[PDB]
């Protein structure tokens, strides 16, 4: 039980930005100039909107999660006119 969730955030204050950047980067990889992506299950998405949803103000900050498919059929339901679209791979980081 795991999907791919794209976070489309647009805040307003660097004192909240830097924190949101680093935090939600801790969840998934950089995708687009304001939007990241993650591959998560129920518990970790819950802990996402736990770690997120207080780093930001709820008036001057807009963030938006996007629950896509189960992250293995994500390729059909998204296309990238510019560079490629690459779901993050659950792979042992052998580096």
């Amino acid at each position: 039980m795991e999907h791919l969730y794209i976070v489309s955030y647009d805040i307003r204050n660097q004192r909240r930005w830097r924190r949101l950047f680093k935090t939600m980067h801790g969840f998934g990889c950089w995708l687009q100039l304001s939007v990241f992506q993650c591959r998560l299950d129920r518990i970790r998405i819950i802990k996402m909107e736990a770690a997120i949803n207080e780093i930001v103000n709820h008036a001057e900050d807009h963030v938006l999660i996007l629950d896509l498919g189960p992250a293995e059929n994500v390729k059909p339901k998204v296309s990238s006119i510019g560079k490629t679209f690459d779901p993050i791979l659950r792979q042992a980081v052998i580096v």
């Binding site: 980067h25 801790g26 802990k47 052998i94 580096v95």
Partner: protein, 348 residues
């Protein structure tokens, strides 16, 4: 009886084979930095273990965060010769490892387990034969005059008078089997794939595949040790494998059944997939060694073997080898309590 909980598992291990790495905590990711130039980063939700394959520096901020998440760092010499391990003042249960220590001091338990512990390795060595025996002509199947003698060794082991005779039988069927091992790879050893099985058990490997064996074995060891610190057992009180420095005396004893399923079934994809060409090697300086060109490939092969979904005989439910290691540890515990009289063994 009948374990119902396996562990789903959030992350998957991080390995560091580069001996010039450097690992910094950065926010929540775990960036590794190389000569002030990054290479990779692990989301600490996605990290399930950490292994440092050699003199790869680490920064104590990472240890504090990792134990603050309790993900087992496992320091490792170059050849994956399991050397170090981190533990946070013991698993917070006592009943499990007191069962362990108690039964260990019972000598009968050790034998009962050393038998099913050694019979479960032969009875999958021979099926690996009858699965990876690369015959070409008058050879398409392994000789039944051998596949009997391994069975003949199985009946020698299910009747072991002691716990040194049984080790002698293990050694006897680790010489015959390895004599017949060279048949397993590339239809017969090709470009210097010299399985000089005489050099088996030699500390620094003399030969290419032995320098890959004594690595796949020596990292299955770590994998079992991590999976034997999850159910809370103590992977150092060995029933018959006495404690040897670098050898978790019981992780060498609950791997014996998975020595052929997980190690000699990754050597026999690394070699049978062109991941070992004798020019892929540090040809000397350790008798022989391996080059990081193929090291980051072999670790990938081993891991993807560890993420293979197979059925477990008791319930036919399919699970990765990792989760299967932990289910089998669970069976070890709930037999240790005497709950389940025998020990379901996972022969194949």
């Amino acid at each position: 009886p009948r374990p119902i909980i396996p562990a789903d598992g959030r992350g998957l291990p991080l390995y560091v084979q580069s001996p010039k790495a450097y690992v910094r905590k950065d926010g929540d990711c775990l960036v590794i930095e190389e000569e002030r130039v990054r290479v990779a980063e692990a989301r600490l939700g996605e990290t399930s273990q950490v292994a440092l394959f050699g003199n790869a520096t680490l920064t104590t901020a990472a240890l504090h965060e990792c134990l603050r998440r309790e993900i087992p760092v496992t320091w490792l010499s170059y050849g994956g010769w399991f050397m170090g391990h981190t533990v946070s003042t013991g698993h917070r249960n006592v009943e499990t490892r007191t069962y362990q220590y108690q039964r260990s001091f019972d000598p009968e338990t050790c034998l009962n387990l050393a038998r099913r512990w050694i019979v479960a390795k032969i009875a999958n060595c021979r099926t690996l034969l009858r699965r990876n025996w690369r015959g070409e002509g008058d050879e398409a199947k392994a000789p039944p005059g051998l596949l009997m003698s391994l069975q003949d060794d199985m009946r020698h082991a299910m009747r072991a008078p002691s716990l040194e005779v049984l080790l002698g039988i293990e050694g006897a069927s680790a010489g015959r089997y390895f004599q017949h091992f060279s048949r397993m790879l590339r239809g017969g050893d090709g470009e210097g794939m010299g399985f000089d099985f005489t050099t088996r058990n030699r500390r620094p490997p003399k030969d290419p595949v032995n320098a890959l064996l004594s690595f796949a074995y020596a990292m299955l060891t770590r994998e079992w040790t991590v999976a034997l610190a999850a159910v809370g057992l103590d992977p150092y009180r060995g029933f018959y494998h006495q404690p040897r420095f670098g050898r978790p005396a019981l992780a060498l004893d609950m791997m014996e059944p998975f020595r052929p399923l997980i190690a000699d079934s990754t050597v026999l994809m690394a070699i049978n997939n062109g991941e070992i060409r004798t020019g892929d090697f540090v040809r000397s300086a350790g008798g022989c060694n391996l080059t990081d060109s193929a090291r980051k490939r072999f670790i990938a092969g081993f891991e993807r073997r560890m993420e293979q979904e197979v059925t477990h005989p008791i319930f036919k439910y399919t699970i990765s080898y990792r989760r299967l290691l932990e289910v089998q540890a669970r069976l070890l515990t709930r037999y240790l309590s005497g709950e389940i009289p025998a020990y379901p063994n996972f022969v194949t």
